[PDB]
Amino acid sequence: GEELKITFILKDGSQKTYEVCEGETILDIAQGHNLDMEGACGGSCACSTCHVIVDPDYYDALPEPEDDENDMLDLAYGLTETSRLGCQIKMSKDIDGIRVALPQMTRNVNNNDFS
Numbered sequence: 001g002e003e004l005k006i007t008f009i010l011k012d013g014s015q016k017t018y019e020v021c022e023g024e025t026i027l028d029i030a031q032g033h034n035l036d037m038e039g040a041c042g043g044s045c046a047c048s049t050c051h052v053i054v055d056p057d058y059y060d061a062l063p064e065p066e067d068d069e070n071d072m073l074d075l076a077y078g079l080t081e082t083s084r085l086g087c088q089i090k091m092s093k094d095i096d097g098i099r100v101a102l103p104q105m106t107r108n109v110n111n112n113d114f115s
Ligand code: FES
Pocket: 027, 041, 042, 047, 048, 049, 050, 051, 069, 072, 085, 086, 087
C-alpha cells in the first residue's frame, strides 16, 4: 500500500504533519522537510538531532539500539519510556499515521567528533 505520513512536534512546540515514502529515516524527513530542529548527534547534519519520542501506538512494534546510540538520546533531560533514535528505524508498512515529538537538550559537559 503506497505512501505514508509523519507528525513531528517541533522544538518550538508546534505540530507538523508531512507526507513521505517508506524507507525514510526520521532524521531524513526532519532534514528533507527542513524542520526547525537541532540535536545531539553528527553536528545537527546528515547525522543529526537523534532524539525523538514516539506515540505509544507506533513504538510498540519497534527495535532499540546499542548503549553507544541510546546515550545520544540520554544527553536530553528526563528521557521517556518511548524516547528513541530517529535513525535505526524508519517509515514502514506498520506506520500508516505515526507521530513523534522532538525534545530539547543542552548538557553540562560537551564534546565534538569528526571523520
Ligand atoms: S542522529 Fe545520528 S545516530 Fe541518530
